[PDB]
C-alpha cells in the first residue's frame, strides 16, 4: 500500500466481504481490498450509511482518480490504522 | 452465510416546475 495519498485523504478501510457496484456513483470491492477514504464533492451526495474512497491498488497504479473513485457500504469493510 | 447488506441511498438535486 501507499503513503503518498489522494487529495483531501481521511483514512483507509479494508474489505472483509466482496461487493458489486449496482449504480452510477457506487465503488466495486473484493474481500481484502484496501480503500483510501476521501471527503465528498457535495454533502447531498453523501449517502446515509455509505463512505467514499478509491481502491488503494487503483491509486498505486496511478489511474484516473475522478473515474476510479466511488461510494461503498462501509459495513463491508473495516477501519484500518 | 452471514454476509452484510448495503444501506439505502437517498434523494439529491430534486427539482420540478
Pairing between strand A70-73 and A11-15? unpaired
Q: C-alpha cell of B15?
A: 427539482
* C-alpha angle A23-A29-A35 in degrees, rounded to nearest 5: 110
Q: Which residues are within 8 A (CB) of A71 and not within 5 positions of it... i.e. 6 or more apart?
A: A25, A26, A27, A47, A50, A51, A52, B9
CA dist A57 and A32 (Å) reads 11
CA dist A29 and A52 (Å) reads 12
**Residue A54's closest CA among A30, A27, A15?**
A27
- Write out chain B residues lying below 8 Å of A17, CB-based: 3-4
**Which of B6, B12, B14 has the highest number of chain A CBs within 10 A, making it the mutation to test binding with A?**
B6
CATH of domain A1-81: 2.30.30.40
Q: Which residues are within 8 A (CB) of A11 and not within 5 positions of it... i.e. 6 or more apart?
A: A37, A79, A80
Distance from CA of B8 to the nearest CA of A (A): 7
Q: Which residues are within 8 A (CB) of A59 and not within 5 positions of it... i.e. 6 or more apart?
A: A2, A5, A6, A36, A65, A68
Cβ of A73 within 8 Å of Cβ of B10? The answer is no
Cβ of B4 within 8 Å of Cβ of A75? The answer is yes
Q: C-alpha cell of A49?
A: 450509511
How is chain A split into domains, by residue range?
A: 1-81
- Interface residue A66 vs chain B (CB under 8 A): no
Give the dihedral sign, CA A15/A21/A22/A25: positive
Closest residue of chain A to B7, computed from CA coordinates:
A49
Q: Which residues are within 8 A (CB) of A47 and not within 5 positions of it... i.e. 6 or more apart?
A: A25, A71, B7, B9, B10
Amino acid at each position: 500500500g501507499r503513503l503518498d495519498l489522494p487529495p483531501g485523504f481521511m483514512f483507509k478501510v479494508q474489505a472483509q466481504h466482496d461487493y458489486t457496484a449496482t449504480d452510477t456513483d457506487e465503488l466495486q470491492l473484493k474481500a481484502g481490498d484496501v480503500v483510501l477514504v476521501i471527503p465528498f464533492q457535495n454533502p447531498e451526495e453523501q449517502d446515509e450509511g455509505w463512505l467514499m474512497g478509491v481502491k488503494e491498488s487503483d491509486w498505486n497504479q496511478h489511474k484516473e482518480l475522478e473515474k476510479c473513485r466511488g461510494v461503498f457500504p462501509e459495513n463491508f469493510t473495516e477501519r484500518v490504522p | 452465510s452471514t454476509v452484510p447488506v448495503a444501506p439505502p441511498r437517498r434523494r439529491r438535486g430534486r427539482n420540478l416546475t
